RNA sequence: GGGAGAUGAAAGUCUCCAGGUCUCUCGGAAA
RNA sequence: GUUCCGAGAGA
């Protein structure tokens, strides 16, 4: 992806876009009992933590462009992840505009706590303004898409996280990129459907983790991903991808049955323009991180690229022998023979992809299923029943949030969800998480919830 | 580095408004 | 399993 321009809003017109500038996130009361680095992202230009110029930091992600049309190793790739796609037989026809709005059995309505993005919100009107679940109504939609059309801007904001420290003096924070309620509903209505399938096939046809439950999942796992594992990782990679991927992604919805008029949607992706603060941009490439879909088409995405890179890198592969599971940009994978990911990369970077070794490792290629991470999480074997696969999200990842609330009332809240993610790590590991929460009166007084009871209910998923 | 307010001589400080797409999960309430 | 409300995590 690559800004091709910017204009001041005083030339284009656009309204100026303006989100909080102040974090939400403060100390808890477990602030100082258990270890942790992370603190909330920078939020404003003058933040006295930076060490860099901010905004230079926000748009370093836009890396540039290399292809913008698919050789043959893409349109085979992308062929060859179309064809494994045709047995989902997705229903390429419009979504009604109500089940785009409202949801369905395997698509959540869209989302009425969230902004409706431009011009709404720089106008005062919320999605409740316009959207109803208890009627259902969709008379006051079609009233705003005929007096405000489509492909309007995205609204730029600075997300509200945590980030390590090194990333707050870096200005690495991240950026949202707020879609049109427009947009959201008008892609809906085109995608709906392979949402739903997506949604509702988490494994290796797919190849996308989307509406999977890892403490189950992760037990299936290693059976999808049988013989030889391998994973690496991306630096940037939304922002990195160049047109060609989106042209990719066309050729597969093409080859699938989706109407000409439908696949064009994809180019208002591709190519799209932004506000940030007063200022108008324009982005060629990339893909705008909150738009409908995001998800999903970086998922499919990475199904092309990786089919892509190991055709153009390697003689004698046979496609049908990969297996792959990918979340957005993160990847899971398996092939019957192991192959060089150094190899790998660097014809990743010809394609303007930075891939990195797996999880800050020295190296590729040494990856294995012990110290394989998917979604943040470990993959461990139960000692009684090692078929059955732990996700372990690490404990210092658990420690970084509970150091932090927006809220000392979602203390209990908090603190249970933690819980449901600790006790895989182990009874040791989980009691001394549990007795430090303990320690001050506040975590004293909560419900923890009982390790074999956790495990009980687990084995019982099975 | 926005809007409105509070306080203040100001610098500041403080409150509200303003902050995506989706998935999974927990909790409260309800039929 | 459903609905509304609140939360957490992940991409
Ligand atoms: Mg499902
Ligand atoms: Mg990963
Ligand atoms: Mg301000
Ligand atoms: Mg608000
Ligand atoms: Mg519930
Ligand atoms: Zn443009």
Redesign the pocket.
Request: with cysteine; net charge negative; proline share 4%.
């Given at each position: 992806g690559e800004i091709q321009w910017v204009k001041p809003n005083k030339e284009t017109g656009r309204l100026?876009?303006?989100?909080?500038?102040?974090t939400?996130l403060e100390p808890s009361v477990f602030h100082d009992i258990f270890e942790g680095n992370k603190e909330p992202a920078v939020?404003?230009?003058?933040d006295p933590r930076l060490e860099v110029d901010?905004?230079q930091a926000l748009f370093s992600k836009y890396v540039g462009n290399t292809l913008h049309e698919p050789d043959e190793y893409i349109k085979e790739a992308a062929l060859h992840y179309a064809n494994q796609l045709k047995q989902l037989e997705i229903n390429t026809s419009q979504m009604s505009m109500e089940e785009a709005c409202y949801?369905t059995?395997?698509?959540?309505?869209?989302?009425?706590?969230?902004?409706?993005?431009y011009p709404?919100?720089?106008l005062?009107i919320?999605?409740r303004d316009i959207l109803d679940?208890?009627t259902r109504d969709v008379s006051k939609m079609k009233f705003y898409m005929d007096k405000y059309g489509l492909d309007l801007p995205?609204?730029t904001?600075?997300?509200?996280?945590?980030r390590s420290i090194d990333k707050i003096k870096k200005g690495k924070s991240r950026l949202?990129?707020?879609?049109s309620?427009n947009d959201?509903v008008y892609?809906?209505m085109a995608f709906g459907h392979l949402?739903e399938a997506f949604?509702a096939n988490?494994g290796t046809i797919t190849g996308s983790?989307?509406?999977?439950?890892?403490?189950t999942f992760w037990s299936k796992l290693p059976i999808l991903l049988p013989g030889s594992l391998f994973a690496f990782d991306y630096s940037g990679?939304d922002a990195s991808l160049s047109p060609v991927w989106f042209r990719a992604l066309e050729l597969v919805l093409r080859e699938i049955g989706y109407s000409e008029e439908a696949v064009s949607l994809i180019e208002g992706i591709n190519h799209t323009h932004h506000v940030y603060?007063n200022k108008t941009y324009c982005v060629l490439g990339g893909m705008p991180?909150?738009?409908?879909?995001?998800?999903?088409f970086?998922?499919m995405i990475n199904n092309i690229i990786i089919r892509a890179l190991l055709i153009k890198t390697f003689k004698g592969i046979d496609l049908d022998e990969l297996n792959m599971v990918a979340?957005?940009?993160?990847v899971l994978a398996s092939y019957p023979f192991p192959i060089d990911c150094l190899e790998l990369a660097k014809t990743g970077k010809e394609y303007g992809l930075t891939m990195t070794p797996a999880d800050k490792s020295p190296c590729f290629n040494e990856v294995n299923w012990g110290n394989a991470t998917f979604?943040?999480?470990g993959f461990l074997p139960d000692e009684q029943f090692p078929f059955l696969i732990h996700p372990t999200?690490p404990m210092r990842?658990?420690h970084?949030?509970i150091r932090?609330?927006?809220?000392a009332?979602?203390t209990?809240?908090?603190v249970?969800?933690?819980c449901?993610?600790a006790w895989h790590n182990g009874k040791q590991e989980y009691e001394k998480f549990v007795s430090t929460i303990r320690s001050v009166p506040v975590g004293r007084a909560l419900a923890i919830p009982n390790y074999e009871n956790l495990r009980r209910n687990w084995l019982e998923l099975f």
């Open positions: 100026n876009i303006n989100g909080p500038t102040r939400k939020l404003h230009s003058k901010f905004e949801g059995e395997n698509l959540e309505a869209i989302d009425l706590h969230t902004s409706a993005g709404y919100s720089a005062g919320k999605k679940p208890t995205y609204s904001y600075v997300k509200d996280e945590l949202i990129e707020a879609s309620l959201s892609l809906r949402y949604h988490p983790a989307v509406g999977c439950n890892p403490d990679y603060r991180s909150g738009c409908s879909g995001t998800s999903i970086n998922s979340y957005g940009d993160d979604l943040k999480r999200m990842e658990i970084e949030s932090w609330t927006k809220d009332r979602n209990q809240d908090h249970r969800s933690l449901l993610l």
